[PDB]
Write a protein that binds this ligand. Sequence first.
Ligand code: AUC
Ligand code: NA
Lengths: 67, 67, 67
Amino acid sequence: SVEDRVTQLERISNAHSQLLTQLQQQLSDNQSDIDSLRGQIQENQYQLNQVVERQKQILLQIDSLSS
Amino acid sequence: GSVEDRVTQLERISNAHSQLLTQLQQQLSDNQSDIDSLRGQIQENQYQLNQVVERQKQILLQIDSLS
Amino acid sequence: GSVEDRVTQLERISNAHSQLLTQLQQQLSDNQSDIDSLRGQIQENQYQLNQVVERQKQILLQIDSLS
Ligand code: AUC
Ligand code: NA
């Protein structure tokens, strides 16, 4: 059974090897995907900041206009 | 030391590896769904941003006449 | 070759798997952490965006009294 247990081990080892290299490729793809998503969230944030800052100016212009 | 002892160890580790690989796969899949979910969320947020930009523009000319 | 050789090999590949496994676990946790963080920020963005929308309604009202 030793020969057979060992053969079973070499087969499972092989499948492990193949899976691990798949997990590795996907993980590093996901990191990049996340980089893109962070990129967009940050730009969105900047756009939001610009919008908010312009609201303040609008609110201030309205006050000047009120006089 | 004996081959039987070493194969027994190897089997023990092999099993631990199979359970770990399953958890990895389960948790990788969760992280991929989240990537897709986050991406859907960002698209929705960009969309609302643009509309806000365009309404703020409609306000800016409403104000420009009254100046 | 010998069951001895095949077992030594299995042990060497099996150590390689354990190390790689630790590294992929890490990389996956980093991907989870980055997602959770990014979820927080996109909710904050949207919360502030909702405040900008209610603010613009008040701005139209104020604009109405000016004319
Ligand atoms: N929605 C919206 Au606005 C401004 N300023
Ligand atoms: Na986090």
